[PDB]
Amino acid sequence: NECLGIGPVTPLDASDFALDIRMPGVTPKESDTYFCMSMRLPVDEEAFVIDFKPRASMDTVHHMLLFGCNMPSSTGSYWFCDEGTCTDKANILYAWARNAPPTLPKGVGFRVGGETGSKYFVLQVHYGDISAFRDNHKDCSGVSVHLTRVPQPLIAGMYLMMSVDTVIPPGEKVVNADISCQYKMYPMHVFAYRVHTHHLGKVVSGYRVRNGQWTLIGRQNPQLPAAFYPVEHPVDVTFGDILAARCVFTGEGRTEATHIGGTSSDEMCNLYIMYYMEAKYALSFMTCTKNVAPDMFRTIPAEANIPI
Numbered sequence: 019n020e021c022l023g024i025g026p027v028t029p030l031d032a033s034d035f036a037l038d039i040r041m042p043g044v045t046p047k048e049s050d051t052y053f054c055m056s057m058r059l060p061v062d063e064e065a066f067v068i069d070f071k072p073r074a075s076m077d078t079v080h081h082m083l084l085f086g087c088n089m090p091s092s093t094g095s096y097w098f099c100d101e102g103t104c105t106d107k108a109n110i111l112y113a114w115a116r117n118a119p120p121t122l123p124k125g126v127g128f129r130v131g132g133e134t135g136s137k138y139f140v141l142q143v144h145y146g147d148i149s150a151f152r153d154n155h156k157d158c159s160g161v162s163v164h165l166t167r168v169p170q171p172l173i174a175g176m177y178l179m180m181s182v183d184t185v186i187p188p189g190e191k192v193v194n195a196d197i198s199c200q201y202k203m204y205p206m207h208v209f210a211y212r213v214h215t216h217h218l219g220k221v222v223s224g225y226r227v228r229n230g231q232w233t234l235i236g237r238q239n240p241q242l243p244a245a246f247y248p249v250e251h252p253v254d255v256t257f258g259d260i261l262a263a264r265c266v267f268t269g270e271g272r273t274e275a276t277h278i279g280g281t282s283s284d285e286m287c288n289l290y291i292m293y294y295m296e297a298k299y300a301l302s303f304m305t306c307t308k309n310v311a312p313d314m315f316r317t318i319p320a321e322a323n324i325p326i
């Protein structure tokens with residue numbers, strides 16, 4: 019977006035404040051550069067993020083990610099971040115990708131600050147072709163954030179399903195990484211997901227299974243842009259439901275028996291479900307790293323086994 023010069027923190031009233039989180043005029047020299055910067059939260063008390071406005075060049079920027087954390091990887095105005103962005107746990111708040119429609123429901127907030135919430139936003143920008151930077155122009159791309167101190171009646175959170183034992187032999191044509199967990203919490207309303215696999219991934223699917231009925235949360239090619247998609251039909255998860263996910267993999271594309279890791283030569287199977295919850299009851303993070311109901315995958319719908 020245009021290069022400012024005015025205020026990153028604009029106080030809009032007694033409860034609300036806006037945060038313009040923008041690269042400080044950057045010029046990448048190679049293709050597929052990863053730049054990060056951080057803004058300290060200017061309140062030491064609970065705040066709720068209630069809106070995002072992407073300020074992206076459609077020309078230069080491929081995708082952006084906003085995280086919450088309390089320990090940013092560097093303390094510079096900007097830095098290269100092909101590593102983990104935050105030294106502590108990075109809570110993803112907002113994903114934007116060039117070739118994708120970006121979708122919060124009314125009343126939904128991400129709780130930050132106070133004794134427990136994130137104290138820092140870290141913004142990541144994926145620049146694509148330096149061809150747009152032939153002119154040594156400076157990019158100021160990023161996100162505008164609406165912060166309120168007013169308790170929001172719905173509170174956003176992230177459900178992460180990952181499969182932890184991931185080795186596939188180099189020839190095996192189809193292997194399933196199956197994840198399932200019993201939901202033992204108060205209701206979450208699922209509104210968006212993100213699937214992530216490496217190169218041997220063909221399709222990733224996530225379901226709520228209640229009384230034997232498979233309701234689709236998401237299905238996506240995990241080789242397509244890595245951002246969040248909107249849940250076609252918003253879903254609710256309740257006590258007694260099973261969350262089930264399946265990553266379908268090959269051993270025809272790589273030559274050795276691939277193991278887990280962060281860099282791109284290992285194999286992950288992750289599915290990110292963004293939800294919200296009533297404020298009284300709301301958890302900001304949940305995980306599933308188990309397969310508690312492996313016999314129940316026997317009635318998985320056929321879509322989950324077909325790559326599109």
Ligand SMILES: [Cu+2]
Nearest residue numbers: 080081144145
């Ligand atoms: Cu990208």
Ligand SMILES: [Cu+2]
Nearest residue numbers: 251252253254
């Ligand atoms: Cu309904």
Ligand SMILES: [Cu+2]
Nearest residue numbers: 215216280286
């Ligand atoms: Cu990965």
